[PDB]
Amino acid sequence: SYDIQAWKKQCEELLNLIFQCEDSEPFRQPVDLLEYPDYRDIIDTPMDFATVRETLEAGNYESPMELCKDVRLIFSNSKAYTPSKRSRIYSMSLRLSAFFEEHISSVLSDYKSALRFHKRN
Ligand SMILES: C[C@@H]1CN(C(=O)c2ccco2)CCN1C(=O)NCC1CC1
Which residues have a Cβ under 8 Å from the Cβ of 65 and sit 6 or more positions away? Answer: 108, 111
**Environment class of residue 65 by beta-carbon count within 10 Å: exposed (0-12), middle (13-18) or buried (19+)?**
middle
Cβ-based neighbour number of residue 39 at 10 Å = 16
Instruction: Give break positions in the chain: residue before each, C–N beyond 2.5 Å.
Output: none
Whether the CB of 36 sits within 6 Å of ligand 1: yes
What's the CA dihedral at 116, 49, 104, 76 to 10 degrees? Answer: 100
Using the Cα atoms of residue 19, residue 23, residue 26 and residue 30 in order, give the sign of their dihedral. negative
Closest ligand 1 atom to residue 87 Cα is: 16
One-letter amino acid for residue 103 of the chain: H
Domain span including residue 64? 1-121
> Measured between alpha carbons, how far is 119 from 121 in angstroms, rounded to an integer?
6
Q: Collapsing DSSP states into helix, strand and coil, what is residue 50?
A: helix
Cα–Cα distances (Å) from 119 to 9, 89, 113, in that order, read 23, 44, 10
When divided into structural domains, the chain yields a total of: 1
Ligand 1: centre distance to CA 83 (Å): 12
